[PDB]
Design a protein around this ligand. Structure first.
Ligand SMILES: [Mg+2]
Ligand SMILES: [Zn+2]
Lengths: 550, 50, 23, 10, 101, 1300
């Protein structure tokens, strides 16, 4: 029962319940003293039972007693139980000290064991450590002086902070924490600004993307906690998924696009057919604007095989490859075949590179290789100049003819329903198949048009080449995108479902490049709203299931 | 007040090492119960355990 | 109750207690 | 038949 | 508190009677520094200061009790305390205690 | 073209002529509240209805009554601005005229002895600002409309989720506006049951017994009768030809299949039947023999073999029975009668009294009034007019248009219709249909709460009149205004639908005033909502926007009014449509609701029209019953009025919306409401043409009430001399617009009005004189135009990250002004009175440098974190200082003071400029010096407008005096008019000075309040959230140096580098089109800039402008030859920074027009340029998409999201750290974090986070001491929450303990 502000008081409902019980017990004693009639004594005993029941467990014996706010009172049981009870809100999940929270950005210069911590958060979280060091080196005589220097933001406080942080791991967390990779230990690098810089390769573990997500920062204090963070919780030790064993640090997006563009083959490029002494020579050739990055060359590759028994066999042969694969061979550690690089590298190929590096080399080589893959992919995705434009969505010329033929055949089945040859359900299931085959044929035509091109070789002949379209490269590299999204981009959006689950007979024959009219957009919203609502309910149900399983 | 829901005799002193009547109002008088007020001179935290 | 969990780094500790409860 | 003390007293 | 049913007034009320850990550390440091400073005085002078200000003892004392514990009177004890306070008012043995204010 | 539009004409890319202008965006609020407050002679709406529903008040005995006459609303004490300044509610007093009359007991009733009539005050009604907002407790609030179930009868079913059988249980449910619910359900054994107030089920026949229905009458109403006769010793049917269509047919040759149509062409009135055909049938009447005196066969009783013989012996020859099938007719009512246990009205009344009041002894008279109160009493049951119309439409009743209570025929027809639905005829009603859902606005809610308060006062008035002692009582003694005021204050301050006004930008204004919520009182629940209500029903076309609904738990439960949606007289949403006659399409339009929409076919604006005004295609696209299809041209009935009819205002501002996925469009619409105004407002290069409507209707701009010429312009005042055609006689002739300058919004954002006018130019009505926040020349301007390159840059735009140049940071394009409130309240305590003074103990002089003599900082002081703003000292009690502390005091002196320093300090990491200080003093307290200075400052500021008005009036009067110079008469008249003007000015200034000098009604216990406004210029930094208008949000990852960013051949670097990877997967292609069109627009802008620079002749400028405005086959006909030379120069000047282009939603610019404008701007047709790397100088080997995009700075800043804590304040009971940045709390280590550490194996980290960091009281102090000492070791203890749990379990009488 405490004074909030300016004479206003805040109490607990237990006070009201206990007051009722005491008042009615006193009334019962007074009635017994006065030798009251039996009916009044009986009613008093009845209310005593009711009040004690409301105190122990309100809303169970009868109607819940409500306070002056027209809300039910909270009893002992109601606060030892429930989601907002003692157990789940204060004994299993606790608010903690030495904690912070900030928006997360991307640090492409960081390493796996490093995270970018703002100096303000580091100063506020590591304050007792700063005080300790200031006293032990004698810059501050007592704790008050140390606080004065820390608050004044003196110069030496920053050196003290960079000595405390030097080898002190910090735990980064993101809500929700679906699995154990949602909390990881990093070595802090102190940065200006107010945002935490996160290594890209760990984002997939956090399910974190930089559109405004925030992360929590925890500072372990005791030596045992620091050893646990450095030995068990380090991001370097956490590179395999505990669910399946597959690597979780596989590159995505920009890295995959860069490594894919670097490992592609172009026909009749500048510097084709040259002979190169090795990866360094290929790098020299591309930096000198002699051979294009997609030029076919013959490169002398030295290659070490590490057998299962530990045999390290070195060999050197001349391999037909491109300049880009020759360069990428520089960062591949010894003990791996060149056949792992001598191909266009999508997401699956890079995942296989990391998997085999872990299998035949261990963890340190794997983490160094993952870092180098990330830097090379970022650099060459930057140098590539991949850009999405409006001429990149090549709508096939067969789409209009197919739509016209589908309309003609739908009208033919429309003048055949009156003949009684078919039923309404048969007409429905036939128009649906007509349009659901027109969709497949339009998608196939678009993919055939978009994934091929015709180039001129050195001889002068016309030769088919895999296309270098931006959207096609995005989809084929596996970076971000798929065939269905391209078919909704440049083909046909397709048949859609009514809010009940039924399928509208007339599909959306227009794509996003040429735009939709009002009805098509309404039909699209019909499914968008379902998707969002089902995502929300799915999150709730999955959380409940995970809690029961744990 | 006395014998209420917040009584200082039953549950303990409100202020640290003091008493309601102020007769014993320092640490030197620990463990001594006032005759005037009946409040044992101790810490306030005992009110979360009594 | 706020004590070490019988898993991970806190496993061996509990084992010793069990040993101390065996004797 | 009823669980309200008020009606019982009535 | 808000439109949500998860936030209550009871979570926004702070315990004001609690002592800050910084204050506890400052108190311990002050005790240690006072012990170090009193270690630089004469045994009788340190004893009279400690007994008349109740340091490391279970009670405080007037000059009657300090006079009776020794073989010494009122004014004698009063001026030993005066001499101690002039000794500790000297700048040489006061820089440490200045930071505690 | 208007003057404010002729300055900067936006090129329109639309092709469809506009027929209906977008109406006032805030009509939904203004019309509702005007209906609430305005006088109603017929008394169906407004406070008149509320007064007439309760008054007159009848006493129990009938001695006297209180009657109502009329009402009025007085002059407000304050206006809106100072109501916000002091923190009081803007309201008008309600003054109602009532008459008290007394009736004598001896004399017959209705004899008037004496009447006492007067005007009594019954509370204060909050008024609505012209912009549709309320000022409650000094804060601006919006009442949000509610979408609720319409009153009436709703027929639905179970769909088969009750029992595993394929049977579907059907039911009906009546919802009154005020009353108790009534349900009629089917059980899974073909019986119909009744449910009153959701209680336990009862046979339906009970509700008929209680209504005076004998079993014969029940069978008559609920069944058809087939009759039998005994003719010539033969059994005899009747003739109903439709019934037969098989033992035989006794119509001779008409016999059949021992199809009926064969000989049904010929009719005979006789059919004979066996005795066996009757055995399985049930009776219909009661048959009594007078001789026997008993009841042989009862109604609804199965007829037996001996029954026929006994009836024949009784002499009865006519036998009518019921009619039962297995498909079309059913025994439901008969079986329900067979399962009922009552036999008479009173027994059924006893049964329903026992059910309604379980355990109560059966009382008859109570029963009567209970049933009469349940449904048939006007006091407890009220079916509104809308509910009455829904009822009369559902069951087909055609009368009782004013009745509001159920009667016999209502329940009879509800039962009949539900049985008809069970038979097969008819269909259930769609629960999500917008004809079944209603819009309830401010007026209706205020009426309801006012009526609740009126009932509260009615009870006491009735009791007091029932006392009877009525000799000297005037009516202002029974009326208690406080309960009514409490009710209205409760509604306007603590309702879930009364929310703080989202004031980031004008779009937030409009979207908050046009929001519709399914939550609130009488609404839905977030956890109890279902899929069906959240889904998009087809009736939402033109009524609710299918795009903008918040992401998350509130998905679908909160909607936005569409652009042209309207509320009819009944509260149902309606949308406009152009009618078609004789195949031609007419300008004039009709508003249709959801019920009226189903019948007609409705085309849409995309349908092509001929020059004759008719459809071109024979098969045009249209809708019927919510299904789209192709329909004949001559069948059309209506067409849509505009292309943006289905989308709301926020989604109508997204260019190229038809090229975006619905998800990303929804994200963009929601995210465009979170934009923060910047220092300089810049128009969108690519827009939709809706910006002017939003800017004008938001109210943030200063709109000219009358035309004329601006007499004077200033940053704070605009004075307009009105033209002599709009001058009301006797008026001064000038209008004064005072502009808001640097006023804090609800979201701590600057509200500033900037003049956009010169002295002397002409202005018309509706013209913009000042631009408010996020407005540029009358156009909505949220973000800024940024040069955009779509290309990956070294991982600094990984995922949705954004790479930003230093040029835009240096140019302050995204800098914002935030105004923050800090309050210091000096109260009165037990020890003494808290004082605001500069004599702060233990504080030096440097900290008092910015403080004045009173103890308040000056205006314009640059303050940083920790600086004192208001110096306040608090009396404190005695401190029992520790022994070493008294050593320190003895050695160093420094005696303690009687006051402690509790002063208002600037929060950490906050540094700004003090821009205003307000001091509020309780009456009777000495006003400090600063309060006096502020008082004189406000008086000096306030006398200026009155001084100017008096000066112009006196100048006109003296000019009249000179012109006049019979003579003495005119001189005396002029002198007396001058005296009258002087007296009026004196009265106005007296009222003003009284307002400023007036004391403040502060809360009890407080003596002084000091309020400081801090202005902070927040620059754009990494971690800030930036977004476009297509759902493409992002967080800035780096502020790149200029020399490191990509640049073009001419050397122009880009401003923002965006990742292309997010475009294909997310299906937001409108952004690429916007980039291309913005590139073209800025190209044309720089061409005009060049033409201006070398001072080319106006002929070439006119030719180029005409060429630009004539591009494409559009609906815009701009004639540059019709503009003056100066007007053309102003247009060219305003087009220097780019040509604004309008691309309406679903009527946008095709790719051909974009490429044509790119060609006109001498830019690549593909929109892709050759960029060069700044770091290396090498050109990128693929062309890169470069252009201009409208970027927004969202109100998600890293400045107010960064938070850190080591040790702070702790909670009172749990002894755990607080939660929140404002409270300096700690992060929550929930269940899943504990699971993650358990999975890792971190026992020690888990133990530390559980005990030391959270609630081990001794542990955390010991750990802090150890860390300061440098030990990094812990001695963990018992968590405090577990001890709380043990005590709580012990309080339940359960012995829980710890063993050793
Ligand atoms: Mg995100
Ligand atoms: Zn005492």
């Amino acid at each position: 029962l405490v004074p909030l502000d300016g004479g206003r008081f805040a109490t607990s409902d237990l006070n009201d319940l206990y007051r009722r019980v005491i008042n009615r017990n006193n009334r019962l004693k007074r009635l017994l003293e006065l030798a009251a009639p039996d009916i009044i004594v009986r009613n008093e005993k009845r209310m005593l039972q009711e009040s004690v029941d409301a105190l122990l467990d309100n809303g169970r014996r009868g109607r819940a007693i409500t306070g002056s706010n027209k809300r039910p009172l909270k009893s002992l049981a109601d606060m030892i139980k429930g989601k907002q009870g003692r157990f789940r809100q204060n004994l299993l999940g606790k608010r903690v000290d030495y904690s912070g929270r900030s928006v997360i950005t991307v640090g492409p210069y960081l390493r796996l064991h490093q995270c970018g911590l703002p100096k303000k958060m580091a100063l506020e979280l590591f304050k007792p450590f700063i005080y300790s060091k200031l006293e032990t080196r004698g810059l501050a005589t007592t704790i008050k002086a140390a606080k004065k220097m820390v608050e004044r933001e003196e110069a030496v406080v920053w050196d003290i902070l960079d000595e405390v942080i030097r080898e002190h791991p910090v735990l980064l967390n993101r809500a929700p924490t679906l699995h154990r990779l949602g909390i990881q230990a990093f070595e802090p690098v102190l940065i200006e600004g107010k945002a935490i810089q996160l290594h890209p390769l760990v984002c997939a573990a956090y399910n974190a993307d930089f559109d405004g997500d925030q992360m929590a920062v925890h500072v372990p204090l005791t030596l045992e906690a620091q050893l646990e963070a450095r030995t068990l919780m380090m991001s370097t030790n956490n590179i395999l998924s505990p669910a399946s064993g597959d690597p979780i640090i596989v590159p995505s997006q920009d890295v995959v696009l860069g490594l894919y563009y670097m490992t592609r083959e172009k026909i009749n490029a500048k510097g084709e057919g040259m002979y190169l002494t090795g990866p360094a020579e290929a790098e020299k050739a591309y930096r000198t604007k002699t051979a294009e990055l997609h030029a076919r060359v013959k490169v002398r590759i030295t290659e070490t095989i590490k057998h299962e028994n530990g045999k390290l066999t070195t060999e050197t042969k001349m391999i037909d490859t491109t300049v880009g694969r020759a360069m990428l061979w520089q960062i591949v550690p010894k003990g791996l075949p060149y056949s792992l690089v001598n191909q266009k590298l999508g997401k699956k190929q890079i995942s296989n590179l990391l998997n085999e590096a872990y299998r035949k080399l261990g963890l340190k080589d794997t983490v160094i290789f993952a870092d180098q893959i990330m830097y090379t992919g970022f650099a060459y995705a930057a140098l590539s100049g991949v850009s999405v434009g409006i001429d990149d969505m090549v709508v096939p010329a067969a789409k209009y003819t197919e739509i016209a033929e589908a309309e003609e055949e739908v009208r033919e089945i429309q003048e055949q329903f009156q003949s009684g040859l078919v039923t309404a359900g048969e007409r429905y299931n036939k128009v649906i198949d007509i349009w659901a085959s027109t969709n497949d044929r339009v998608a196939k035509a678009m993919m055939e048009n978009l994934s091929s091109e015709q180039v001129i070789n050195r001889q002068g002949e016309q030769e088919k080449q895999e296309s270098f379209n931006s959207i096609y490269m995005m989809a084929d590299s596996g970076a971000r995108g798929s065939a269905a999204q391209i078919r909704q981009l440049a083909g046909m959006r397709g048949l859609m479902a009514r809010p009940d689950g039924s399928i509208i007979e007339t599909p959306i024959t227009a794509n996003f490049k040429e735009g939709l009219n009002v009805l098509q957009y309404f039909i699209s919203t019909h499914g968008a709203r379902k998707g969002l609502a089902d995502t929300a309910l799915k999150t709730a149900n999955s959380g409940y299931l995970t809690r029961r399983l744990v | 007040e006395r014998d209420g829901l917040f009584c200082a005799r039953i549950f303990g002193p409100v202020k640290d090492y003091e008493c309601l009547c102020g007769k014993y109002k320092r640490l030197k008088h620990r463990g001594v119960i006032c005759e005037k007020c009946g409040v044992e001179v101790t810490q306030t935290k005992v009110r979360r355990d009594r | 109750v706020g004590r070490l969990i019988p898993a991970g780094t806190g496993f061996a500790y509990h084992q010793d207690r069990q040993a101390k409860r065996a004797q | 038949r009823t669980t309200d003390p008020v009606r019982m007293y009535m | 508190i808000g439109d949500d049913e998860d936030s209550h007034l009871g979570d926004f009320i702070e315990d004001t009677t609690l002592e800050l850990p910084l204050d506890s550390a400052t108190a311990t440091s002050l005790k240690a520094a006072t012990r170090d400073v009193l270690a630089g005085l004469t045994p009788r002078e340190a004893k009279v200061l400690r007994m008349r200000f109740g340091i490391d003892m279970n009670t405080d004392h007037t000059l009657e009790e300090v006079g009776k514990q020794f073989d010494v009177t009122r004014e004698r004890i009063r001026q030993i305390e005066a001499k101690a306070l002039r000794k500790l008012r000297h700048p040489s043995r006061s820089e440490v205690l200045r930071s505690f204010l | 073209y208007s003057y404010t539009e002729k300055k900067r004409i936006r090129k329109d890319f639309g092709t469809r002529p506009q027929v209906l202008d977008i109406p006032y965006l805030l009509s939904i609020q203004l019309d509702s509240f005007e209906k609430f407050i305005e006088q109603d002679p017929e008394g169906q709406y407004g406070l008149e209805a509320a007064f007439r529903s309760v008054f007159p008040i009848q006493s129990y005995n009938g001695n006297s009554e209180l009657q109502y006459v009329s009402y009025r609303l007085g002059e407000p004490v304050f206006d809106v601005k100072e109501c916000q300044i002091r923190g009081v509610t803007y309201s008008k007093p309600l003054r109602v005229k009532l008459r008290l009359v007394i009736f004598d007991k001896d004399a017959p009733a209705g004899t008037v002895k004496d009447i006492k009539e007067q005007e009594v005050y019954m509370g204060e009604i909050p008024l609505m600002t012209e912009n549709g907002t309320f000022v409650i407790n000094g804060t601006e609030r919006v009442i949000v409309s509610q979408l609720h179930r319409s009153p009436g009868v709703f027929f639905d079913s179970d769909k088969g989720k009750t029992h595993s059988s394929g049977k579907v249980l059907y039911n009906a449910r009546i919802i009154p506006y005020r009353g108790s619910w009534l349900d009629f359900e089917f059980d899974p054994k073909d019986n119909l049951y009744v449910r009153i107030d959701r209680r336990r089920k009862l046979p339906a026949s009970i509700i008929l017994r209680v209504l005076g229905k004998t079993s014969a009458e029940i069978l008559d109403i609920f069944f058809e009768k087939v009759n039998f006769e005994v003719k010539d010793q033969t059994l005899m049917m009747e003739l109903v030809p439709e019934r037969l269509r098989t033992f035989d047919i006794e119509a001779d040759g008409k016999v059949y299949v021992e199809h009926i149509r064969q000989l049904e062409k010929d009719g005979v009135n006789f059919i004979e039947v066996p005795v066996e055909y009757i055995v399985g049938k049930v009776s219909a009447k009661d048959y009594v023999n007078e001789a026997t005196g008993e009841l042989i066969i009862t109604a609804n009783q199965e007829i037996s073999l001996e029954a026929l013989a006994n009836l024949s012996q009784a002499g009865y020859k006519k036998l009518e029975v019921l009619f039962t099938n297995d498909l079309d007719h059913g025994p439901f009512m008969s079986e329900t009668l067979r399962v009922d246990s009552t036999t008479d009205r009173i027994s059924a009344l006893v049964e329903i009294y026992r059910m309604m009041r379980p355990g109560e002894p059966p009382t008859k008279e109570a029963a009567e009034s209970l049933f009469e109160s349940l449904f048939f009493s006007a006091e407890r049951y009220d079916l509104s007019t809308v509910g009455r119309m829904k009822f009369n439409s559902s069951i087909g009743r055609e009368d009782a248009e004013e009745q509001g209570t159920l009667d016999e025929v209502d329940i009879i027809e509800v039962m009949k219709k539900l049985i008809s639905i069970r038979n097969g005829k008819g269909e259930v009603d769609d629960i999500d249909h917008l004809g079944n859902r209603r819009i309830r606005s401010v007026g209706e809610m205020a009426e309801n709460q006012f009526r609740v308060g009126l009932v509260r006062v009615e009870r006491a008035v009735k009791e007091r009149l029932s006392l009877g002692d009525l000799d000297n009582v005037m009516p202002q003694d029974l009326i208690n205004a406080k309960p009514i005021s409490a009710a209205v204050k409760e509604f306007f301050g603590s309702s879930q639908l009364s929310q703080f006004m989202d004031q980031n930008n004008p779009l937030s204004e409009v979207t908050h005033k046009r929001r519709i919520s399914a939550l609130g009182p009488g609404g839905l629940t977030r956890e109890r909502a279902g899929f069906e209500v959240r889904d998009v029903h087809v009736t939402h076309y033109g009524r609710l926007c299918p795009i903008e609904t918040p992401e998350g738990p509130n998905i679908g439960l909160i909607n936005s009014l569409s652009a042209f949606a309207r509320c009819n007289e009944y509260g149902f949403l309606e949308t406009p449509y152009r009618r078609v006659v004789n195949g031609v399409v007419t300008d004039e339009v009709d508003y249709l609701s959801a019920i009226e929409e189903g019948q007609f076919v409705i085309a849409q604006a995309n349908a092509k029209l001929t020059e004759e005004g008719g459809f071109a295609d024979e098969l045009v696209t249209a809708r019927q019953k919510g299904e789209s299809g192709l329909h004949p041209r001559e069948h059309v009935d209506y067409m849509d009025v505009a292309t943006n009819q289905v989308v709301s205002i926020a989604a109508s501002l997204i260019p190229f919306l038809e090229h975006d996925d619905a998800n990303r469009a929804l994200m963009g619409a929601n995210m465009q409401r979170q934009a923060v105004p910047t220092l300089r407002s810049e128009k969108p290069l690519v827009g939709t043409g809706i910006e002017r409507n939003v800017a004008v209707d938001s109210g943030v701009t200063a709109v000219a009430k009358r035309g004329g010429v601006i007499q004077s312009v200033d940053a704070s005042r605009i004075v307009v001399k009105v033209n002599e055609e709009e001058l009301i006689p006797g008026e001064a002739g000038i209008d004064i617009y005072n502009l808001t300058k640097y006023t804090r919004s609800n979201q701590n954002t600057c509200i500033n009005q900037r003049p956009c006018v010169m002295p002397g130019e002409p202005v018309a009505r509706g013209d913009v004189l000042a631009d408010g926040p996020s407005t540029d020349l009358g156009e909505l301007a949220l973000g800024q135009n940024m040069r955009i390159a779509f290309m990956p840059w070294n991982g600094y735009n990984f995922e949705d990250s954004i790479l930003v140049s230093e040029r835009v940071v240096q140019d302050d394009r995204f800098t914002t002004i935030h105004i923050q409130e800090l309050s210091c309240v000096a109260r009165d305590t037990k020890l003494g009175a808290e004082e605001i003074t500069a004599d702060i103990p233990n504080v030096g002089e440097a900290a008092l440098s910015k403080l004045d003599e009173s103890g308040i900082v000056y205006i314009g002081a640059e303050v940083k974190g920790g600086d004192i703003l208001v110096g306040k000292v608090t009396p404190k009690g005695e401190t029992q200082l520790t022994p070493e502390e008294k050593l320190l005091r003895a050695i160093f002196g420094e005696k303690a003071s009687d006051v402690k320093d509790t002063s208002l300090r600037v929060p950490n990491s906050v540094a700004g400029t003090v821009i205003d200080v307000q001091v509020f003093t309780r009456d009777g307290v000495e006003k400090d010096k600063r309060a006096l200075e502020i008082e004189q400052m406000q008086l000096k500021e306030a006398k200026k407008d009155l001084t100017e008005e008096f000066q112009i009036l006196e100048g006109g009067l003296l000019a009249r005096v000179r012109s006049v110079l019979e003579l003495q008469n005119q001189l005396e008249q002029l002198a007396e008019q001058y005296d009258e003007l002087k007296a009026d000015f004196d009265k106005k200034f007296e009222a003003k000075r009284r307002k400023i000098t007036q004391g403040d009604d502060l809360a009890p216990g407080v003596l002084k309040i000091v309020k400081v406004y801090l202005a902070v210029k927040r620059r754009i930094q990494p971690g800030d959230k930036m977004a476009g208008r297509h759902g493409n949000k992002g967080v800035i990852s780096k502020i790149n140096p200029v020399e490191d960013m990509p640049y073009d051949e001419n050397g122009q670097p880009v401003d923002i580098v965006l990742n292309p990877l997010g475009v294909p997967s997310r299906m937001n292609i409108g952004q690429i089109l916007e980039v291309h069109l913005g590139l073209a627009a800025k190209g044309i802008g720089d061409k005009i800039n060049q033409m201006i620079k070398e001072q080319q002749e106006l002929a070439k400028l006119r030719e180029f402008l005409q060429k630009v405005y004539d591009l494409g086959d559009t609906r815009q006909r701009v004639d540059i030859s019709e503009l003056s030379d100066e007007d053309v120069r102003t247009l060219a000047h305003n087009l220097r920074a780019g040509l604004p282009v309008a691309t309406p939603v679903f009527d946008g610019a095709p790719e051909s027009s974009i490429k044509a404008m790119l060609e006109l701007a001498d830019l690549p047709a593909s929109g892709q340029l050759t960029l060069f790397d700044g770091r290396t100088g090498d050109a990128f080997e693929r062309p890169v998409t470069v252009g201009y995009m409208y970027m927004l700075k969202l109100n998600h800043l890293v400045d107010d999201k960064m938070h850190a804590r080591s040790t702070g304040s702790y909670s009172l009971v749990t002894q755990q750290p607080l939660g929140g940045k404002a409270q300096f709390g700690g992060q929550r280590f929930g269940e899943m974090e504990v699971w993650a550490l358990e999975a890792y194996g971190a026992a020690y980290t888990l133990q530390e986070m559980l005990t030391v960091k959270s609630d081990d009281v001794n542990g955390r102090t010991k750990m802090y001491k150890n860390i300061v000492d440098g030990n990094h070791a812990m001695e963990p203890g018992m968590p405090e929450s577990f001890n709380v749990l043990l005590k709580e379990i012990r309080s339940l009488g359960i012995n829980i303990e710890l063993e050793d």
